[PDB]
Amino acid sequence: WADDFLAENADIAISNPADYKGKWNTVFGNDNPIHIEVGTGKGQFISGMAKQNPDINYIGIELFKSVIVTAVQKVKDSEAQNVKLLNIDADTLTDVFEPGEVKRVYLNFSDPWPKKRHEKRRLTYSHFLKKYEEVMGKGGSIHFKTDNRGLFEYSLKSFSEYGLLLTYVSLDLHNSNLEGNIMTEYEEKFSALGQPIYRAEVEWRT
Amino acid sequence: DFLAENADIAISNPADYKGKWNTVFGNDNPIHIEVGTGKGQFISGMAKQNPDINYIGIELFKSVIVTAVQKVKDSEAQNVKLLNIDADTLTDVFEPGEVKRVYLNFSDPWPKKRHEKRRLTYSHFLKKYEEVMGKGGSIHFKTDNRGLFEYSLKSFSEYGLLLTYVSLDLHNSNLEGNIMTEYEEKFSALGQPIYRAEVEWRT
Ligand code: NA
Structure with missing residues (x-):
């Protein structure tokens, strides 16, 4: 099974990630x-x-x-x-990492949860931005890719309301020559489709 | 003429009405x-x-x-x-706070890096908008140019403005009272996306 x-x-x-909170360097050996x-x-x-x-x-x-x-x-x-x-889940991140132990959060094709009453389940909603802050501390960035136009528009506004700085934005990633772009399984099946892949990098202000 | x-x-003499554009409109x-x-x-x-x-x-x-x-x-x-x-003359014509909103429609993209300073969403111009609006105003921005829209979202963010509206396909986003420009109406038959942002100052 x-x-x-x-x-x-x-x-x-x-299986025991909470046991390594503040000691993840000892897990990787560097x-x-x-x-x-x-x-x-x-x-x-x-x-x-x-x-x-x-x-x-x-x-x-x-x-x-x-x-x-x-x-x-x-x-x-x-x-x-x-x-x-x-x-x-994302809520458990603060049981596993100390502030500053994570340098970056990748979000790739997160559930859009388009209904108004499901806003709080989006991984770009303010509650999760705060969880990401509690593991990344002062610096830290979010690298975000989605095909969902509604989610990306929502996320740009959520990022902005939270006070993050937008340092990269592409509204058509596959025509934007991002060198070393690593596709997800879902993303791979889009270049033929022709629909734009949206991408943002956003950072905490320091 | x-x-x-x-x-x-x-x-022809707009600088003479600085601080008294209400006397021009009468309200x-x-x-x-x-x-x-x-x-x-x-x-x-x-x-x-x-x-x-x-x-x-x-x-x-x-x-x-x-x-x-x-x-x-x-x-x-x-x-x-x-x-x-010209846009640099706005501060000779308006008192801070006399303007409540700035509309920017299909502005020249100036993609060459030496001409970033000519883009109307460059920080120099966001400061001129601030000098005629104070902190009680907004910028409503439409463009079909993906490069200029991407630059502008980043320029807004670096300047510290709040993004309160963004459409990455305006003509499929159902903006109820959208007034088009000549260019917007004619060249949107292509199905080329129209980008739109509303940004405001943080109080
Ligand atoms: Na090791």
């Missing part, structure tokens, strides 16, 4: 920056980023146990030693 | 300006839509502003003036 697979690969899929992805899905993005940037430590967060099993297999097939995976 | 004979619409209706009015379809249409708002359009080229004058005349609207001035 999926639960046996994750128990057997517990060196990648860390003092390199830790970047996280909230919503790893099947794990092509974080595996690709781990192989591209071996001097960056990566931690994928993925609530959905069914899909994280796949992420563990792609991390294993990658042979990258700089990536762990946590089967937790 | 066409302008001399329509000098109650085209004001304390909020003053909204357009920087780069072109042939005037937009400011004519806005004036007809919002008779409770005083509109002042600025156009650098006299050859273009005479067409704007005619369109204002044809609309029969009494709440529109047109100034043949």
Whole structure:
């Protein structure tokens, strides 16, 4: 079963992440920056980023146990030693990291939750911006990609209301020559479609 | 000269009314300006839509502003003036707070980095808008140019303005009273996206 697979690969899929709060450098065995992805899905993005940037430590967060099993297999097939995976939600980030332990949050094709009464479930809503702040501290950035126009418009306004600085914005990423862009599985199936991929980098003011 | 004979619409001495544009309109209706009015379809249409708002359009080229004058005349609207001035002259014409909103429609993109300083969303110009609006105003910005819109969102953010509205496809976003420019109406048959932002000052 999926639960046996994750128990057997517990060196990648860390079962006790709260035990490493403030000590994640001892987990990776170096003092390199830790970047996280909230919503790893099947794990092509974080595996690709781990192989591209071996001097960056990566931690994928993925609530959905069914899909994280796949992420563990792609991390294993990658042979990258700089990536762990946590089967937790965004609310638990503050149980796992101290302020400043994370340098960057990746969000890729987050659930848009388009209905007004579901605003608080969007991963760009103010509550999650605060969770990201509590793990990144003074500096820190969010690198955000979505195909959903409603979510990206909402996110630009949410980022702005929170007081973040927009340093990068593309309203058509695949025609914008972002060198070293690592696609998610979902993103790969868009260049043929022709619909724009939206991208933002936003940072805390210092 | 066409302008001399329509000098109650085209004001040749706008610097003389600084701090007293309410004496020109004859009321304390909020003053909204357009920087780069072109042939005037937009400011004519806005004036007809919002008779409770005083509109002042600025156009650098006299050859273009005479067409704007005619369109204002044809609309029969009494709440529109047109100034043949540059955007740097705005602080000679308006007291801080006398203007309540700045409209920017399909402004020149100036993509070359040496000409960033000519883009009307560059910090120099956001400061000029601040000097005529104080902190109680907004900028309403439409463009089809993706590069200029991307630059402008970033320029707004660096300046510290609050983004309260953004559409990445205006003609599929159902803005109820949208008044188009000549360019907006003709060249939106392509299905090229129209970008729109509303930004304001943080109090
Ligand atoms: Na180690």
